[PDB]
Amino acid sequence: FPSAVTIKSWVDKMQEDLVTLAKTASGVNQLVDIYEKYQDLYTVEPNNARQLVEIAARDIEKLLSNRSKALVRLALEAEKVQAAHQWREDFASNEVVYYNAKDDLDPIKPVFIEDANFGRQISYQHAAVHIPTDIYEGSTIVLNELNWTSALDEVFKKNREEDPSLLWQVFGSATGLARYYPASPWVDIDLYDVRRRPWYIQGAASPKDMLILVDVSGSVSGLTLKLIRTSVSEMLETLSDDDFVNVASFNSNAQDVSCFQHLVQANVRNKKVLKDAVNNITAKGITDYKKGFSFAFEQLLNYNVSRANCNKIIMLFTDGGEERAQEIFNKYNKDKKVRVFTFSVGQHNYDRGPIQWMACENKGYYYEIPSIGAIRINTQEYLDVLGRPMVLAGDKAKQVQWTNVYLDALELGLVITGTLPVFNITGQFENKTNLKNQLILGVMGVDVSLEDIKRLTPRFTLCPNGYYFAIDPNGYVLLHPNLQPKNEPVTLDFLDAELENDIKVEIRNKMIDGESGEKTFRTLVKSQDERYIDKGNRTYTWTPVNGTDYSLALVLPTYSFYYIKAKLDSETLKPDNFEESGYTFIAPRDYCNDLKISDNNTEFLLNFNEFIDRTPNNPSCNADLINRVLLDAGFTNELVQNYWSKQKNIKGVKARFVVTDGGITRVYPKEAGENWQENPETYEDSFYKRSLDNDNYVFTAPYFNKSGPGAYESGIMVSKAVEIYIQGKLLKPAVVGIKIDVNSWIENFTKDCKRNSDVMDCVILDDGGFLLMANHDDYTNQIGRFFGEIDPSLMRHLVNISVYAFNKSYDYQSVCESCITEQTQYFFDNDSKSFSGVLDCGNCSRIFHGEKLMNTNLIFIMVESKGTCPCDTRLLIQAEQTSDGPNPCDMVKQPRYRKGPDVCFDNNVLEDYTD
Numbered sequence: 002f003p004s005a006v007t008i009k010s011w012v013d014k015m016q017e018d019l020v021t022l023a024k025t026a027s028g029v030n031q032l033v034d035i036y037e038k039y040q041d042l043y044t045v046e047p048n049n050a051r052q053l054v055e056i057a058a059r060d061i062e063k064l065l066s067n068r069s070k071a072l073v074r075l076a077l078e079a080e081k082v083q084a085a086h087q088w089r090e091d092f093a094s095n096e097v098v099y100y101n102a103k104d105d106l107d108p109i110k111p112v113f114i115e116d117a118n119f120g121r122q123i124s125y126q127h128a129a130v131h132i133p134t135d136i137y138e139g140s141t142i143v144l145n146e147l148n149w150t151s152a153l154d155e156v157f158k159k160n161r162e163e164d165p166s167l168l169w170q171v172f173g174s175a176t177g178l179a180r181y182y183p184a185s186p187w188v189d190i191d192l193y194d195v196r197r198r199p200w201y202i203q204g205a206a207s208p209k210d211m212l213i214l215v216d217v218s219g220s221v222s223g224l225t226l227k228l229i230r231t232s233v234s235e236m237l238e239t240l241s242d243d244d245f246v247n248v249a250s251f252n253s254n255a256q257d258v259s260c261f262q263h264l265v266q267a268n269v270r271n272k273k274v275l276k277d278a279v280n281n282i283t284a285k286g287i288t289d290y291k292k293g294f295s296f297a298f299e300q301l302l303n304y305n306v307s308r309a310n311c312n313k314i315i316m317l318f319t320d321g322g323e324e325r326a327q328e329i330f331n332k333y334n335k336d337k338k339v340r341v342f343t344f345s346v347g348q349h350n351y352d353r354g355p356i357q358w359m360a361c362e363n364k365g366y367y368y369e370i371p372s373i374g375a376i377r378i379n380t381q382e383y384l385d386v387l388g389r390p391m392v393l394a395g396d397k398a399k400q401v402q403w404t405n406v407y408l409d410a411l412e413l414g415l416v417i418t419g420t421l422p423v424f425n426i427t428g429q430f431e432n433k434t435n436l437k438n439q440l441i442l443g444v445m446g447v448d449v450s451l452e453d454i455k456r457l458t459p460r461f462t463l464c465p466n467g468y469y470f471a472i473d474p475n476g477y478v479l480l481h482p483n484l485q486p487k488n489e490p491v492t493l494d495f496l497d498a499e500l501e502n503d504i505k506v507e508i509r510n511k512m513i514d515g516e517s518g519e520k521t522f523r524t525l526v527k528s529q530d531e532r533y534i535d536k537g538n539r540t541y542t543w544t545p546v547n548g549t550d551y552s553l554a555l556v557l558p559t560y561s562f563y564y565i566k567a568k569l570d571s572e573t574l575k576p577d578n579f580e581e582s583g584y585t586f587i588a589p590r591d592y593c594n595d596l597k598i599s600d601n602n603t604e605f606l607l608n609f610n611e612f613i614d615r616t617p618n619n620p621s622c623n624a625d626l627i628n629r630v631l632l633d634a635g636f637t638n639e640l641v642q643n644y645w646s647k648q649k650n651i652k653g654v655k656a657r658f659v660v661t662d663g664g665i666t667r668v669y670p671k672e673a674g675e676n677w678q679e680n681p682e683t684y685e686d687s688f689y690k691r692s693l694d695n696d697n698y699v700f701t702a703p704y705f706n707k708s709g710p711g712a713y714e715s716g717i718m719v720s721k722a723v724e725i726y727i728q729g730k731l732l733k734p735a736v737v738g739i740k741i742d743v744n745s746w747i748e749n750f751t752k753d754c755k756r757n758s759d760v761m762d763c764v765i766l767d768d769g770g771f772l773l774m775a776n777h778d779d780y781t782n783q784i785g786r787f788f789g790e791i792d793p794s795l796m797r798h799l800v801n802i803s804v805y806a807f808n809k810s811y812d813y814q815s816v817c818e819s820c821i822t823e824q825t826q827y828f829f830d831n832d833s834k835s836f837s838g839v840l841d842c843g844n845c846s847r848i849f850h851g852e853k854l855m856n857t858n859l860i861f862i863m864v865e866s867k868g869t870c871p872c873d874t875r876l877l878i879q880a881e882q883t884s885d886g887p888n889p890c891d892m893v894k895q896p897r898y899r900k901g902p903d904v905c906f907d908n909n910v911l912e913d914y915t916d
């Protein structure tokens with residue numbers, strides 16, 4: 002094995018060659034020199050974090066003022082209209098006419114004029130009614146609703162006309178009947194119950210400490226167990242994240258069905274765990290209600306755990322019996338703080354008297370489930386039963402509640418919904434009320450798209466590493482870069498998108514209560530692509546949103562504290578000029594409302610240049626965005642004309658490129674244009690951000706086993722961010738790039754580590770353990786894969802000796818047959834350039850010396866061949882591994898710190914609760 006000095010000399014020579022070639026061919030010096038030479042065409046302006054967060058908070062509060070005023074208006078007029086309703090029965094003569102969606106033209110037929118802000122056909126003349134497929138059409142229980150909701154369309158018209166930015170307006174009733182205003186055909190045996198939706202549920206009840214008990218007696222084993230499992234699973238589905246639920250089973254003794262021994266939050270992971278636990282249940286023993294309910298009661302009074310002190314409930318899943326257990330209820334529940342809802346599931350002939358008495362005495366309700374199908378309807382009922390204190394609150398239940406981000410029904414994007422319920426309370430001066438008013442007519446809601454929220458968020462004046470994020474008092478994120486749809490509400494915690502520490506949890510527990518401040522901390526950050534980790538200083542500025550429960554914050558790496566502007570060409574952005582200017586891509590952003598994104602990019606180029614070409618004033622068009630993009634295109638053209646033209650063809654350099662802020666890309670030769678595979682949006686490509694954060698050269702490895710050839714003829718991507726100093730103040734405008742022919746690198750790698758023999762291994766890796774160069778001539782075919790997938794022993798020993806530190810993220814968005822993805826990414830932790838040791842699997846030992854490449858992220862390892870002694874502990878894989886995330890059995894006993902809503906309505910003295 003060669004000496005350490007020889008390996009150091011080889012590393013120095015290789016790193017000098019690579020660095021020099023990348024620097025000379027990419028042309029960082031010329032670009033930065035141009036940027037520092039003009040100082041005229043651009044303006045550097047401060048990006049005030051606290052000011053921006055305040056402006057965004059007030060703006061979003063105003064948009065919520067819009068969408069709450071609309072809702073109070075619609076609800077008030079709904080109450081007024083139904084209050085003075087005849088309840089016409091004989092609708093034979095009075096044929097009511099309405100526009101039913103999802104219908105067919107086989108014997109209203111609107112022209113269906115398509116407008117912006119909606120992807121599909123809309124008609125503002127009429128409103129569209131959605132009814133569940135299972136429920137029946139025109140009858141004595143739907144036609145009345147279809148009549149008295151015919152006056153809601155006027156309010157819809159008025160609301161839209163007074164505010165043209167409204168997205169959607171819906172009203173949900175006790176029998177479905179979603180009447181949504183911008184009448185659009187439905188999806189295209191579709192299942193959608195309006196009452197079975199988070200926005201319906203969150204408005205129709207209060208945050209509840211639900212408990213579940215299941216009758217698991219051996220005598221009722223069979224189909225009843227399956228019905229119980231499916232019913233309780235659908236119950237858990239009904240539970241939102243504002244409620245705490247736990248399931249226990251009792252058979253002469255009560256025990257937890259799962260690893261949880263207390264009330265846990267009803268989030269997706271816990272809900273799945275409870276569902277799986279109940280699905281694993283089996284029936285054995287004799288029933289004893291007393292000890293079951295007792296246990297449920299100290300679980301209710303279990304104040305040692307996290308709870309929303311609000312709306313305590315028991316939900317018993319029984320069949321029938323002759324045991325009322327008066328004394329058990331009397332001992333624990335004398336003031337009657339706990340509701341008890343009991344079920345009679347299955348078809349049997351047991352006595353149901355005590356079962357009904359339990360609900361009757363404890364202010365709960367009793368339900369029967371004779372067969373599959375009635376579970377969906379029966380589940381909605383207890384929520385409306387819980388609304389009795391809420392309906393009797395009067396001028397206190399009038400408070401809109403904003404849902405979390407969830408996918409819209411007609412495929413519009415990420416949206417949240419407002420909620421308000423409608424009552425029949427009327428005539429306060431006489432009070433013929435205190436009646437049927439107990440029940441609600443349903444809930445009505447408006448929608449705001451996350452595109453609308455992000456229109457209030459100007460991200461393009463920041464760096465790609467900066468962004469916005471807002472968090473609700475539960476703890477999840479309302480808006481985040483990593484918040485991406487999968488196709489169910491999307492749920493990302495603040496410490497589930499970013500990387501966890503003590504400072505981030507401290508600030509997520511310091512602004513979730515609704516405080517403000519600033520804090521700069523030194524941590525490690527994550528790249529756009531799930532392959533690399535990085536490190537940098539980020540400052541977080543946060544302020545509460547006074548109008549709502551939300552809390553927004555802003556992030557700034559300490560080089561995007563300032564930004565760039567432009568004070569106050571055509572030939573550059575011409576496809577026919579690509580022969581000399583290179584195959585340009587333009588970033589499909591909202592440059593102008595007149596044009597649209599194309600993704601095509603070629604067409605987008607035609608549209609962009611035809612709009613820019615023709616007076617060029619553009620009276621209804623953006624100003625700063627187009628100005629910056631023009632200036633940046635000028636810069637890219639200047640670079641290509643001055644430097645890249647001089648050396649038309651380099652043996653080792655397959656291509657060159659420069660991506661910038663503004664969205665202009667330049668690949669010098671024509672043939673390399675079709676080799677370009679990445680996103681034209683410069684805020685979306687990973688390497689842009691990675692290079693800005695790393696102060697060294699960044700070698701992006703190509704993908705391995707990717708569809709279509711992209712390794713041999715594409716080359717190796719190298720980058721280095723451009724940093725400028727105007728008046729001693731930092732900014733990171735652009736990054737440059739090169740494609741390195743693999744053949745040239747191979748031929749120059751044979752100068753030391755000669756090939757065609759199996760004696761020693763010479764491989765060059767980067768951050769993340771991706772193979773870039775190898776001598777074996779069979780590893781060089783497979784360039785671009787994770788190095789642990791070919792030599793896992795070496796990577797594991799490298800991890801143990803602490804040259805590669807990894808921490809795993811858990812991303813909950815995946816395509817699987819809502820799996821959790823284990824996101825492993827590696828990086829250098831110990832800033833030690835030299836590393837040596839012996840890799841021994843037993844008697845056989847291999848001497849290795851690993852020396853890092855200076856001013857890059859590459860590592861060269863000089864280890865013996867695998868033929869000397871076989872050793873493979875396990876094939877270590879770095880990819881999106883499908884596996885269970887962190888165990889919730891341990892994270893519920895020390896969960897994330899929550900703040901609950903102070904607004905609750907329960908234990909009302911005026912409450913009737915006759916049933």
Ligand SMILES: *[C@@H]1O[C@H](CO)[C@@H](O[C@@H]2O[C@H](CO)[C@@H](O)[C@H](O)[C@H]2NC(C)=O)[C@H](O)[C@H]1NC(C)=O
Pocket residue numbers: 083084088424425426427437438
């Ligand atoms: C609030 O809603 C209920 C639901 O319809 C109304 O109950 C109806 O009351 C009328 C009174 O004449 C009866 O004719 C109907 O038969 C009732 N409905 C049902 C389903 O039986 C109630 O009247 C409403 N409250 C007010 C103040 O009108």
Ligand SMILES: *[C@@H]1O[C@H](CO)[C@@H](O)[C@H](O)[C@H]1NC(C)=O
Pocket residue numbers: 060063064066067163164
């Ligand atoms: C909110 O309401 C006002 C009053 O009509 C309206 O002009 C405004 O555009 C709405 N939206 C926002 C974001 O303020």
Ligand SMILES: *[C@@H]1O[C@H](CO)[C@@H](O)[C@H](O)[C@H]1NC(C)=O
Pocket residue numbers: 087088089095096097098148151
């Ligand atoms: C609803 O019923 C009333 C009778 O109270 C009738 O006059 C009215 O026209 C009906 N509405 C529609 C849309 O026809």
Ligand SMILES: *[C@@H]1O[C@H](CO)[C@@H](O)[C@H](O)[C@H]1NC(C)=O
Pocket residue numbers: 500501502806807808809830
């Ligand atoms: C990130 O990696 C460091 C070093 O390996 C480790 O100390 C830290 O706990 C990791 N962070 C997370 C959130 O796992």
Ligand SMILES: *[C@@H]1O[C@H](CO)[C@@H](O)[C@H](O)[C@H]1NC(C)=O
Pocket residue numbers: 600601602603604605
């Ligand atoms: C864009 O549309 C034009 C229309 O003629 C077509 O020629 C071109 O190939 C398209 N490019 C892409 C990438 O879709």
